[PDB]
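User: My advisor, Dr. K., asked me to get a structural model of this assembly before our group meeting. I'm new to this, so sorry if the format is off. These are the inputs:
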Amino acid sequence: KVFGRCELAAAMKRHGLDNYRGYSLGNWVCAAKFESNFNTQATNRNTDGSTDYGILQINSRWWCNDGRTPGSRNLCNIPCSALLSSDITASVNCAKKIVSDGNGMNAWVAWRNRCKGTDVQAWIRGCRL
Ligand code: NA
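Assistant: The format is fine. Below is the predicted structure of the whole assembly, which you can bring to the meeting.
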């Protein structure tokens, strides 16, 4: 599913991401934009042979099982395929664990490089939330 910007903002808000670990909703929408362009089915292979899955490009090195990432963990206790669903519940629940891991949203290199310190409120501008 390719979410609309406000559509994804509403879904993230409903699932309690708005101000989760102190990160405003626009931070999450901005991260999703640059990770996946709001496409739940986004997959990208990392140099280390792990894969990033779904709207927030959650990595098989630590967070989900894809069966092809040697020596990896599955800390969200989910198949990586669950992160590609039209229903973002598994992505949001796993994102809550990631952002609680100690580096906050710096875990998402695209958030650090493209969203951090920017006017992230612009990402929820116009949305009926
Ligand atoms: Na894994």
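One thing worth pointing out at the meeting: The pocket of sodium ion is lined by residues 60, 64-65, 69, 72-74 (CB under 6 Å).

User: Perfect, thanks a lot.
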